[PDB]
Design a protein around this ligand. Sequence first.
Ligand SMILES: Cc1cc2nc3c(=O)[nH]c(=O)nc-3n(C[C@H](O)[C@H](O)[C@H](O)COP(=O)(O)OP(=O)(O)OC[C@H]3O[C@@H](n4cnc5c(N)ncnc54)[C@H](O)[C@@H]3O)c2cc1C
Length: 628
Amino acid sequence: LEETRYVFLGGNQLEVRFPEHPHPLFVVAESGFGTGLNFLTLWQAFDQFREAHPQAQLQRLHFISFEKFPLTRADLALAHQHWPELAPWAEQLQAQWPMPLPGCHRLLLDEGRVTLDLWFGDINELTSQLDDSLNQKVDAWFLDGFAPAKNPDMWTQNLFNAMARLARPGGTLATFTSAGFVRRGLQDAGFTMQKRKGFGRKREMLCGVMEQTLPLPCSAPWFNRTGSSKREAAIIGGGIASALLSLALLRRGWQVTLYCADEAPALGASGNRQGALYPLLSKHDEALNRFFSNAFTFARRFYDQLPVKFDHDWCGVTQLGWDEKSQHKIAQMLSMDLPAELAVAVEANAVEQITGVATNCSGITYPQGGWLCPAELTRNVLELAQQQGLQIYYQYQLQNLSRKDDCWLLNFAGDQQATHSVVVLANGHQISRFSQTSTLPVYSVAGQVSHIPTTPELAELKQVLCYDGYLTPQNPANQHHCIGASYHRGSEDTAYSEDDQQQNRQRLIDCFPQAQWAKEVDVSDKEARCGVRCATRDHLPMVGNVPDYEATLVEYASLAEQKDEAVSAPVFDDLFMFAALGSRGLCSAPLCAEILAAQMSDEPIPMDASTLAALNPNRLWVRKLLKG
Ligand SMILES: Cc1cc2nc3c(=O)[nH]c(=O)nc-3n(C[C@H](O)[C@H](O)[C@H](O)COP(=O)(O)OP(=O)(O)OC[C@H]3O[C@@H](n4cnc5c(N)ncnc54)[C@H](O)[C@@H]3O)c2cc1C
């Protein structure tokens, strides 16, 4: 343990650099996370640092690391037992220890003080897939793992080059090994290397620093994500998206203001009483599946950590093949062989025990999922945000935006205007109401969810059912269930429809004609909540810089043939969008808020270049332009 401190903290001059670090955030990357020893050690060091030097500018730690073969958290725990001194940190690390899914996993520890990005996979396979936003963001490197002798496999020119790419100018690195090919390899990668006495009986150790500013690669500029240098932003919003975002920004030292068109928040699509938390898995869409898996697990972690009162139960969500198409989608999902803590098959006989209700058919189950009250969540997250200093103006409806020299002029309804440095459009299905956004491949889908009274037999239902519509367990606070899914493409109408009311029960009955419990559902009270989803085909949100449609057509007019020498993606200055959350919003919103707030602050974004491109707003125009 003292050798850990020596090698990795000492080798990077961290205890000295910290209090002199002229930035709010410090970024550290690690070739393997192993048992998490190095990270815990560093975390302790960081806490001691903050405790001893409150005046210091550096308030936040960011730690990126890789593990190819993660641990079961039981083994992680009893591994952590060897170092009792670190317990108070390790416990936290365990509390949030992520599920063994591929890709990037963000953990928010110590209420944001310490951010950990765990990438599960082969580090050499993953360096390729890392996002450009990560280039030169790394202040210090822990090059660690099994000794080069006895495991040369990890130590490759690939790795050295990658470390060189991510290390910011003046950034450092340290490793326990003095091995030659490592030194010369790191020198080829562009580091300036120095030997240093090893710890105790061991021999010389290596540490170096990047003493030059290398050229930044920018592989595919049409997809690239830029932030802002300005720290003051306005959000147009009042739904879950805006709330989560505002937390994420305030956390990062942003001065935030929210304008909402309605009297209160959560009167848009986020206004439901009960809504379902679960991932959309795809076997044949890589991005979609990656994103929903990681965003779903992050979502649960986040919701657990979030210090807010909101009705909810994670009771598990069960999805039944009631017919062919469904049985088949389910089948594919089960064919992709995923950890059972994510999704697992359920036979028709087990279905009654698990859901409390007999569907007379098999299905799949997401055990970590459930229902939550989105309206209460949004409302209360916003309240928390105001405490944190969020400035909210209700009844401000944004009519149009104009770009002045250093800012954005916002023109609202009712003769009101504001002026802000940065602007984010969070406003839901109305995202397209502005000239800058009018061409976006998003569309309105109105929908109606019915509020039904609970009954002794329905009270037996322990999980959210997903069939054609969906039926939630009752929320005991109101003694009702939500049952829903009315779907109208192209419709912005929020008016109650008796047709939809009736179709909500109908779908259920139709899916389980033999089931007595289902006949219990009673919509006769004409009670429902209606809202307008903003959707895309491909089913992913649009999060990032608002692209300039015309410029994007003019430039890129060729692309194709001309893919080199291309300009960065044409974009409006300091204008970002968080939108097209679909029907899956409670799942995607937290990690999106993270991705966007990270992007705007020029910090590390917790996701790979591909899935990120899959989330990008200029997506369709760009891929159509790539060919004809
Ligand atoms: C019928 C239905 C069922 C759903 N089921 C689920 C579910 O099962 N699981 C799940 O996770 N999600 C569900 N959702 C929600 C889905 O996730 C939505 O996409 C999500 O609620 C979007 O929230 P948002 O913050 O992006 O926009 P919204 O919640 O619609 O909020 C947009 C906000 O922007 C404001 N605004 C609009 N224009 C302006 C302007 N010009 N100036 C100022 N303010 C403006 C509005 O006041 C509004 O408050 C459901 C939604 C509906 C309608």
